Design a protein around this ligand. Structure first.
Ligand code: A1BPP
Ligand code: ZN
Length: 139
């Protein structure tokens, strides 16, 4: 679990969005596993606007932060789960690191701010949904 709180927006994994997120929907994209909802309170986070390929993410299944090198946002095949059919997930960045399904929502940050959230993982892999291209989150 986890979310990004920026301005009057809450960014979460689309597959983990609540009834309240859907009732206050701003934007969602199944191909990216992202959903953004509106909030009444001002958010605590800053979004990175950069091309960093290293950073640190929070891994809830270890209660620890890990440094990672990750690939640029791209279209990557993701196997079928309970939440989605087998498909290509866009704007996804992969890195070698520990992840379990419940780690989704953990933030990946670089020196400039929030880069994205955990969305996929495998045998020693962790995948992050990028948010750096969503310029409207800052206005
Ligand atoms: C080891 N392992 N295995 C699945 C998984 C995971 N993702 C999942 O459980 N997924 C289910 C929810 C939708 C996700 C998607 N973006 O399509 C995939 C996150 C982190 C480590 C993971
Ligand atoms: Zn950066």
């Amino acid at each position: 679990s986890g979310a990004i709180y920026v301005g009057n927006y809450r960014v979460v994994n689309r597959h983990l969005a609540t009834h309240n997120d859907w009732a206050n929907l701003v934007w969602e994209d199944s191909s990216r596993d992202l959903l953004v909802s509106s909030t009444t309170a001002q958010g605590c986070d800053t979004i990175a606007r950069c091309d960093c390929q290293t950073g640190v993410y929070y891994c809830s299944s270890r209660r620890k932060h890990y440094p990672v090198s990750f690939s640029k946002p791209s279209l990557i095949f993701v196997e079928a789960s309970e939440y989605y059919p087998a498909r290509y997930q866009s704007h996804l960045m992969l890195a070698v690191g520990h992840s379990e399904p419940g780690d989704c929502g953990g933030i990946l940050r670089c020196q400039h701010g929030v880069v994205g959230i955990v969305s996929t993982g495998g045998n020693g892999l962790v995948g992050f949904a990028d948010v750096r291209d969503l310029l409207w989150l800052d206005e």
